[PDB]
């Protein structure tokens, strides 16, 4: 390539180095709270005193910051520099810095965290060396003056061209532009990596999770047209869904529920994939409002399933698991509620499973079919499995009363099925 371009690359490699006094004054005057002149004049020591006071306040709120007080905020942390050390110690510093940003992600509207992060900014040059974790751990706060300050400071990586246009102005970016950013693809991959590490360190918060799920749902909502784009988007979003369910909080699990339901209604998936997702939900379901959300999204999953084998039964282990996590009286009451999501496909599959697998709770089958109005082909399907259960099982007055209910409702259909097989 050309000489000018290669010198531009060497300049980018030497962004951080403070060669002459002009470059030092520039790099120093870049800072977070203070404006130009005052940021230029004040010294590391005064910065570090302010930082230490802020860190004592933060450890008073929560004790996880004794680590950074021990390591990144001491006397050698005054003395040291990035641009002197060997690359492996550099990688260890990047490890500790990313730990800091992850752990301070959940306090960003407080002057204490603001000041300690200004220490990291004005000594470890993080706003030039590793801007990625700064932007991504501070993304959801996208209407706040602290984010406006970081936009006026930072130098963007070539994944963020939208914010790269919005740098250095008076208006915060808009949700449309955020949705452009998340409509990009490699950025989606990078965000999955960050969220994976965040879960595996087990520190998320509600606004963080809410912003993530709203961005993902709008991304799929835009891409409702290009099916090939949805097909290349499936592994990304569903693997973030699987890790998010693997987390142990009600917050994580409910968020993953919303992502799954909007994806399932946006694109018709395969039945085995649907069953695997249900298997994860049931295998990690823990709390009460979690049970509520899980039942709703399971219902919507089987509802948006449409194809051959639409009304097939649950496989055995799945059916045992589902009943065990879902006692029958609870789902009865949920049916008795007023909100009443559409439920016919899933409920018919459930009762056909109870028929072929349980062989006892036909009375509960009777009451469920009492409470909900179903469809014609479903009625014939129920009738088929009940007919075969009659032809095998030793007879029962409960089976008598069930067929009595069907004679009271659609006896001609019953006789049609007997004309298919029987008397």
């Amino acid at each position: 390539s050309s000489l000018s371009d290669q010198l531009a690359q060497v300049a980018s490699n030497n962004a951080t180095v403070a060669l002459d006094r002009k470059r030092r004054q520039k790099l120093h005057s870049a800072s977070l709270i203070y404006n130009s002149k005052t940021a230029a004049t004040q010294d590391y020591d005064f910065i570090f005193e302010n930082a230490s006071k802020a860190l004592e306040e933060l450890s008073q709120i929560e004790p996880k910051f004794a680590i950074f007080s021990r390591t990144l905020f001491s006397e050698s942390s005054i003395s040291l520099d990035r641009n002197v050390q060997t690359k492996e110690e550099i990688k260890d510093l990047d490890n500790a810095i990313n730990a800091y940003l992850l752990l301070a992600s959940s306090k960003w509207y407080l002057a204490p965290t603001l000041h300690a992060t200004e220490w990291l900014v004005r000594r470890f040059q993080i706003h030039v060396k590793n801007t990625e974790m700064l932007l991504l751990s501070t993304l959801n706060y996208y209407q706040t003056p602290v984010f406006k300050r970081i936009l006026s400071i930072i130098k963007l990586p070539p994944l963020f061209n939208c914010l790269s246009n919005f740098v250095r102005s008076e208006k915060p970016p808009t949700a449309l532009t955020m949705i452009k950013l998340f409509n990009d693809m490699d950025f989606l991959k990078l965000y999955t990596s960050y969220l994976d590490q965040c879960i595996k360190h087990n520190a998320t918060y509600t606004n963080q999770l809410l912003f993530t799920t709203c961005c993902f749902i709008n991304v799929v909502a835009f891409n409702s047209n290009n099916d090939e784009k949805l097909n290349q988007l499936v592994p990304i979003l569903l693997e973030i869904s699987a890790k998010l369910l693997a987390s142990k909080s009600k917050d994580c699990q409910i968020a993953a529920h919303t992502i799954l339901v909007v994806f399932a209604t946006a694109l018709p998936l395969k039945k085995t994939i649907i069953l695997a997702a249900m298997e994860t939900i049931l295998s990690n379901l823990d709390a009460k409002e979690a049970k509520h959300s899980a039942l709703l999204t399971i219902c919507k999953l089987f509802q948006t399933l449409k194809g051959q084998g639409n009304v097939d039964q649950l496989p055995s282990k799945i059916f045992k698991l589902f009943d065990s996590k879902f006692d029958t009286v609870s789902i009865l009451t949920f049916l008795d509620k007023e909100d009443k999501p559409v439920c016919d496909k899933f409920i018919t599959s459930y009762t056909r499973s109870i028929a072929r697998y349980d062989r006892s709770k036909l009375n509960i089958i009777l009451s469920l079919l009492k409470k909900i109005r179903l469809e014609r082909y479903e009625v014939r399907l129920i009738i088929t499995d009940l007919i075969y259960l009659s032809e095998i099982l030793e007879d029962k007055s409960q089976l008598v009363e069930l067929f009595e209910y069907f004679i009271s409702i659609n006896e001609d259909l019953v006789l049609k099925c007997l004309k298919s097989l029987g008397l």
């Binding site: 006397e75 050698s76 040291l80 087990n202 693997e239 990690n284 698991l321």
Partner: protein, 111 residues
């Protein structure tokens, strides 16, 4: 005589050593937020080294010139590890109520 703890502390401060901070960053964890066949001729064999560039790389001391098989093949293993690095997957992993990983498993299966 070796100096005690306060003398160590003052020494580290006044000389401005940063080895403590480096070992602290090193120990920094976001943890908390045989064989089955033998080769008789390979144990019997005696091969030379000094023929050319390759085994004269494999040499270890300046006096030795002929090395038998088990040390030879062990040296070759060391040399191969020098050239091609070892990745962590082959140093660690083996595949060995329903679980959690079923969704990711079916996702990695289907195209």
């Amino acid at each position: 005589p070796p100096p005690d703890e306060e003398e160590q502390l003052l020494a580290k401060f006044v000389f401005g050593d940063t080895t403590d901070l480096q070992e602290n960053l090193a120990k920094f964890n976001a943890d908390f937020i045989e064989a089955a066949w033998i080769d008789s001729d390979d144990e019997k064999i005696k091969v030379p080294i000094l023929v050319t560039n390759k085994t004269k790389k494999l040499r270890t001391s300046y006096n030795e010139s002929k090395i038998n098989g088990v040390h030879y093949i062990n040296r070759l293993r060391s040399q191969f590890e020098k050239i091609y690095p070892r990745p962590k997957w082959v140093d660690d992993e083996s595949d060995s109520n329903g679980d959690i990983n079923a969704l990711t498993k079916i996702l990695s299966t289907t195209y």
